[PDB]
Structures are given as C-alpha cells and as structure tokens.
C-alpha cells in the first residue's frame, strides 16, 4: 500500500494499556499464582503468551474470570513477566533469573526464554 | 531501574491484537457508523482515542455493547482510523484526507489530526 506509519503508535498503545491495568479499568480476568492474584486484560495476555493464547481461544476457558496457574509457578516471576507484557521492560536479576525463565517457559514467551538462556550461559 | 527492553515487543503486541480483531476474538463492542458496523476491543479504542477513552471510563457507557457515532461521521474515514489504531499505518489519500481529518478530530486522535493538517497545508 501507500500508507504512512506513526513510529511511536505501538509504544503509546501499550503505555495506555498499562495505565488501564494500573487503574483496574476493563480488566476481565484474575490470574491466581498460589496465594497471589493479578488482574489483567485477556487480550494483552493472549498477545504476549502462547499459553494464554491457547487458554482464551478455548470455547469454555474464554469465559472464565479466574485462571489458576500450576502451583510450581513463582508469583514474583509471574509479576515480572506481567510487567514485561505491559511495558516491554524485563526486570531480570541474578536473584530472579531462574524463576523468570521457568515462568517464561510455562507461559510460552520465547523471546524472554531466549534472553534468560543467554544471560545464564554468560555467567557459566 | 536496571531493566532490559525488547525493542519489537510493543509492535508484536499490536500485531497480535490486530489478528484477534480480524478473527473476531474477544471483541466486546460494535461501533455503528450510519449503515456500517465495526467490531473492536474497547481497550484498544480507549488506548488510541480521547473520545473512546471518555466513553468507556463512563460508569454507564463502559457496559454498552453498541456505540452509535454522530451521523456526520463517514464510515470509510472511521474504517481507515480503526485500521490505524490496530496497525500504526494510516491510509491517507487525496480522496479521503478531509473525511479522515474530520473523523480524527471527532475521535480525538491528535497525531492523525496533525499529519492531516500538514498534508493539506502542503497542497495549498
């Protein structure tokens, strides 16, 4: 086509989606990770994660307001990944890298899994 | 913070949101523009438009499944802007620029209004 493109549009959309999440506006699901609860938008979770994409395209699970993750999932690792989904920024630290990589593998977030593998390889 | 950032994350999220729109997955509103209907996600519309942000933060309108726009709004102009919201690409042409600018003014999409003004000024 002959379209023009606004470079900052995708980033501005994601920033506003994160502002809606922070103010709990039109969030339609709560993700339960052991004793912890995280409110989010199903569309953003699907757009970022192969696991959520599969869950919310399922004809019965698409209608659930609560999703319980596997008990082995670490709430902090999930929190870091949820923040990444809504900001593009990943808080990867020596103290959390193992939990973040395991959570990214479970959530099917291949780019996160990739950077965790590389950061671990460098420390070996 | 000490975060790392994935450059293509925002663009990849928007691409997946557009794929969900194309397959009519988790769309929660229909925008009526005279004889034409457009299905969308309320969160994306709010993230892109000052008008939709005001509508869907309203305690009664947040729950409506149908929103009717002003009869002066051109369906093609709306379609072009809805495509822009979900892709960052604006199909701006001599034959549609007036309808696109008027629709962008109504929807409160200031960056679109700005490029329309500049493209019109250049042709004068």
């Amino acid at each position: 086509d002959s379209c023009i493109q606004f470079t900052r549009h995708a980033s501005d959309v994601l920033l506003n989606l994160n502002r809606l999440r922070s103010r709990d506006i039109l969030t339609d699901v709560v993700i339960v990770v052991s004793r912890e609860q995280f409110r989010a938008h199903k569309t953003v979770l699907m757009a970022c994660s192969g696991l959520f994409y599969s869950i919310f395209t399922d004809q019965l699970k698409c209608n659930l307001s609560v999703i319980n993750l596997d008990p082995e999932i670490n709430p902090e690792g999930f929190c870091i990944l949820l923040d990444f989904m809504y900001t593009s920024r990943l808080n990867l630290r020596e103290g959390n890298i193992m939990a973040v990589m395991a959570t990214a593998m479970y959530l099917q977030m291949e780019h996160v899994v990739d950077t965790c593998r590389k950061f671990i390889k460098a420390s070996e | 913070d000490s975060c790392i950032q994935f450059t293509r994350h925002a663009s990849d999220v928007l691409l997946n949101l557009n794929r969900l729109r194309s397959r009519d997955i988790l769309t929660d509103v229909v925008i009526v523009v005279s004889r034409e209907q457009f299905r969308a996600h309320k969160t994306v519309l709010m993230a892109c438009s000052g008008l939709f942000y005001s509508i869907f933060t309203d305690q009664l309108k947040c729950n409506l499944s149908v929103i009717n726009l002003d009869p002066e709004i051109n369906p093609e102009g709306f379609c072009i802007l809805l495509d822009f919201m979900y892709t960052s690409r604006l199909n701006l042409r001599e034959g549609n620029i007036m309808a696109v600018m008027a629709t962008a003014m109504y929807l409160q999409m200031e960056h679109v209004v700005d490029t329309c003004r500049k493209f019109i000024k250049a042709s004068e």
Partner: peptide, 4 residues
Amino acid sequence: WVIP
C-alpha cells in the same frame, strides 16, 4: 510519521 515515516514511509514504512
């Protein structure tokens, strides 16, 4: 704005 750019030409993509």
